[PDB]
Amino acid sequence: DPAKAAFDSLQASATEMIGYAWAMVVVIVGATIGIKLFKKFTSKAS
Amino acid sequence: DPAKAAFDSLQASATEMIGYAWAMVVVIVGATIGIKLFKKFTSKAS
Amino acid sequence: DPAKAAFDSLQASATEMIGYAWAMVVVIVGATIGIKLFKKFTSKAS
Amino acid sequence: DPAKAAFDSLQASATEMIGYAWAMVVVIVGATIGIKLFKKFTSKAS
Amino acid sequence: DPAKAAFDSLQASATEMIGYAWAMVVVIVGATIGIKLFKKFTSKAS
Amino acid sequence: DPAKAAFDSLQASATEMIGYAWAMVVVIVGATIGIKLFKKFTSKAS
Amino acid sequence: DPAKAAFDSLQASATEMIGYAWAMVVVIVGATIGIKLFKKFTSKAS
Amino acid sequence: DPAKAAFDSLQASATEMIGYAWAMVVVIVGATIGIKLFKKFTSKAS
Amino acid sequence: DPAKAAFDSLQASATEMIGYAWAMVVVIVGATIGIKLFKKFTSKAS
Amino acid sequence: DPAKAAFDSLQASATEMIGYAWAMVVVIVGATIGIKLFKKFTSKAS
Amino acid sequence: DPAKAAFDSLQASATEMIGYAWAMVVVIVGATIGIKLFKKFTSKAS
Amino acid sequence: DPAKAAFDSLQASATEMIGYAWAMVVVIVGATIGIKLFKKFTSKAS
Amino acid sequence: DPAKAAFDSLQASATEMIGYAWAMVVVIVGATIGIKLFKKFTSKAS
Amino acid sequence: DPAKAAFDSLQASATEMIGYAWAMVVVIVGATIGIKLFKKFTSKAS
Amino acid sequence: DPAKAAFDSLQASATEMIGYAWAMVVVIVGATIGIKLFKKFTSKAS
């Protein structure tokens, strides 16, 4: 069955991209939250 | 009746593909919603 | 009348095929609408 | 009538999904409002 | 006139399906608007 | 002239069918537009 | 002219729905503004 | 020339329908913009 | 040559119809684009 | 060339609508900014 | 070769229309972006 | 029977072409879906 | 063999037309994509 | 077998075009995401 | 190969537009951030 194999391959490609997307999100969000806390704690400290 | 058998076969093939489609959708949607909640809760928490 | 009998048989065959077609349509459309609602409600819920 | 039965089934499936969506919404919103009040009352108390 | 009768029947079938479609729309839209208001009022209340 | 009469009859039959077609179109289009506006205004109102 | 009548009916249906939409908007907006002022004046008063 | 007359009639019918379409658009758009401004000014005023 | 004359006449008739077709297109397209811009600018303005 | 004339007319219609849109924007924005400054200066003055 | 000449003419007509299309786009987009910036800067300024 | 052999050969040729068609489809669809997901996940990630 | 020569000539004519078709496609598609990107980047930039 | 060779060639051409498409996508998406992050980080930084 | 050349040209056009878009963004963002800092520092200074 040609269809069975095809869908398997598609689903594997998708799984890989999702992997790459998670990596990126973690970097960008890391920095957004980083800057937010730096602004907040500096104010409270002083 | 040749037609009866033919339609049966077609309907079985279709049933199988629908199976494969559901698998894929669950993966892709899983990740979309995953990233959305991660962005949202991280913000509220901080 | 040979013609009368012939048309009757043709009309019966057609009636049967229409039956098989309805079965198939209900399956395919079932899945199309299924996936559409799953995508829509998941988004609104989150 | 094939159509009557078909629409009934579709409408039942939809009713079930709506059920699942309400469950999810209640969890997510529960937490959003939870965190908001915790932040607010802690501040006023101190 | 065979045509007159035929068109009458078609138009009756269509009228019935439109009936079933209205039922479905009312359910789906009911839930979409329901969730939207629940999200909105909960926020304003808190 | 046999032809003159024949064409007259054909043209009358056609005129009648066009009549029946207009009736049907008005029903189907009525519902399509109906549902579209219901979806649109409900959203804006809420 | 079948078209003239058809458009008239469509335009009447639309006019009615707009009526129902205005009713809903007035209720929802009434409450949103109500809560906003209650929050604001209570604070200033105390 | 049969064609000349025919095209003239078609073009007149089209001109009339365009007339009816403009009437409808003005009503629907009138209400959409109406509701949008009511929501916006009420908020700013309060 | 009978053929030469015949083709000339055909080609003239065609040229005339193309003329009538251009007139119609300009009217219909005029209105389609008209309504599209009215919808678009009204939204942006408000 | 039928096309040249057609595009000219379309472009003139568009130019006119843009004119009407600018008029509206100036009114709405005038009021939004008006209310904003009234709220701001009254507070600072008192 | 009749074909060579024909394609040349078609390609020239197309080139001219593309010219007219660019003119229109520049006008419409000019205004869309114009209104967007006016709304944005007025807000920031005040 | 010359006919029996002939139909067998035709049916074999067809079976082979279907094979080649499946190969091509899998490549083209692979890329279409690939690009679609790349566009979608990149947006959500950022 | 008269047939051999004939097919050769036909195949040459076809090859030439395909050449002219490619030229045209490149112009039309050039403009379609051009306008699409102009609309997209102008929006993002502003 | 003429068909076998033909399909092979088609599939090779397609493979090459897909190559060129990927190149273009990477450029366009590169810039879209670039501008988005520049807008976002500049705001948070200031 | 006509396709190879075509894609090259498209990709060059795109590269140029991206250039123009970056220029615009730098101007608009320059001013937005400019005004924001002027408002902020003036307040803190006084």
UniProtKB/Swiss-Prot annotation, chains A, B, C, D, E, F, G, H, I, J, K, L, M, N, O:
GO CC term (a single one): membrane
Segments in the Cytoplasmic topological domain: 39-46
Membrane topology field: Single-pass type I membrane protein
Domain of life, source organism: Viruses
Subcellular localization, as worded in the UniProt entry: Virion; Host membrane
Main localization, broad class: virion
Transmembrane segments: 18-38
Periplasmic side, ranges: 1-17
Keywords annotated in UniProt: Capsid protein, Helical capsid protein, Host membrane, Membrane, Signal, Transmembrane, Transmembrane helix, Virion
Family (UniProt): Belongs to the inovirus capsid protein family.
Function: Self assembles to form a helical capsid wrapping up the viral genomic DNA. The capsid displays a filamentous structure with a length of 760-1950 nm and a width of 6-8 nm. The virion assembly and budding take place at the host inner membrane.
The protein's assembly and partners: Homomultimerizes. There are several thousands of this protein in the phage capsid.
Protein name as catalogued: Capsid protein G8P
Organism field: Enterobacteria phage f1
Shown chain mapped onto the complete sequence: 28 to 73 of 73
